[PDB]
Amino acid sequence: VLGMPAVESNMFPLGKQAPPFALTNVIDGNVVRLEDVKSDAATVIMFICNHCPFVKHVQHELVRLANDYMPKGVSFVAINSNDAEQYPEDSPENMKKVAEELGYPFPYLYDETQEVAKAYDAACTPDFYIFDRDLKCVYRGQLDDSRPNNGIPVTGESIRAALDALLEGRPVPEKQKPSIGCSIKWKPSA
Numbered sequence: 001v002l003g004m005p006a007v008e009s010n011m012f013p014l015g016k017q018a019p020p021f022a023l024t025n026v027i028d029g030n031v032v033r034l035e036d037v038k039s040d041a042a043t044v045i046m047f048i049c050n051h052c053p054f055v056k057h058v059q060h061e062l063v064r065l066a067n068d069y070m071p072k073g074v075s076f077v078a079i080n081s082n083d084a085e086q087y088p089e090d091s092p093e094n095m096k097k098v099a100e101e102l103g104y105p106f107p108y109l110y111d112e113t114q115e116v117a118k119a120y121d122a123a124c125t126p127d128f129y130i131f132d133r134d135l136k137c138v139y140r141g142q143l144d145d146s147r148p149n150n151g152i153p154v155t156g157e158s159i160r161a162a163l164d165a166l167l168e169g170r171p172v173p174e175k176q177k178p179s180i181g182c183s184i185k186w187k188p189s190a
Contacts, residue, residue, distance in 0.1 A: 006054065009141055009178035010123045018043065018135045019119035023079065023109035026096040032077070032107050038135060039075040042166045044159065045129040047122040047184065049082045050098050051089040054181030055125050057148045059102055062126075065156045066105050069163055076106035081117035082125070082185040084110075090185070117184055124181035130162050130172070138162065138172045142179040 022033045037043050046062065048055045066076045082090040092110045099108045111117055120129060130139035139162040146152040162172045 004183060006180050007124045007183045008180050009127050010121045011176075011178060012121050012129060012137055012140045014137050014140070014176075016137050018045065018129070018131045018137065019116065021079075021109075021111070021116045021119075023111055023116065024092070025107040025109050026092045027099050027104070027108055030107075032109055034135070037075040037077050037107075038133075039073060040133055041073050042133070042138075042163055043075040043131045043135065044069075044077070044163075045120065045131070046076070046078045047081060047117060047120070047125055047127040048078050049080050049087070049090050049125040049182065049185075050094060051087065052125045052182040053148050054179075057146070058126055058143050058154060061143065061154045061156045063103060063105065065159060068160075070105060072163075072167060074163055074167075078104065078106055078108045079111050079116060079122075080108065081111040081114045081122065083114070083187045084112075085187075087185050114184070114187060122184055124179060124183055126181055127179050127184075128159060130159065130166070132166060138166065139176060141176045145177075147180070 020034050025032045084091040132138050144155050144157040146154045165172045
């Protein structure tokens with residue numbers, strides 16, 4: 001038996017408050033907090049990593065999406081909770097290099113204790129969350145219908161539709177499907 005199976009989102013509860021977080025941003029070394037990303041419209045939190053085919057599948061769109069919506073007032077934050085001792089590619093130093101290479105326009109924070117991933121009940125990479133002006137969860141799941149194995153072009157449609165609804169004062173579409181990807185690399189149970 002080689003490798004590990006992919007896992008799906010755990011579907012964080014709609015309406016639940018975004019859990020707190022105070023983590024170092026590898027791009028500039030600043031400690032960034034939830035309060036620092038609270039938005040007047042929406043806050044998008046993304047759990048990702050550097051060596052996962054499901055993340056590689058969406059990396060380009062993450063940048064396109066953030067560039068389209070950050071100017072509209074939407075906040076974006078990427079968090080890497082993978083144990084860097086098991087997966088060196090997820091070390092803060094490597095995270096910094098990746099952010100520079102891909103030109104991530106949003107903070108890339110490292111959650112070394114994994115307490116933030118557990119609080120958001122993040123399960124895979126990538127795992128997407130959207131919270132409203134009051135930091136209540138209004139969307140969680142996939143980026144869009146595309147997957148590494150289906151041929152559908154990447155569009156970011158699911159998140160784009162949710163953000164548009166939030167910016168226009170309309171309810172986020174009800175249909176919310178789980179994301180799928182590599183399991184977050186948890187440290188041994190303590």
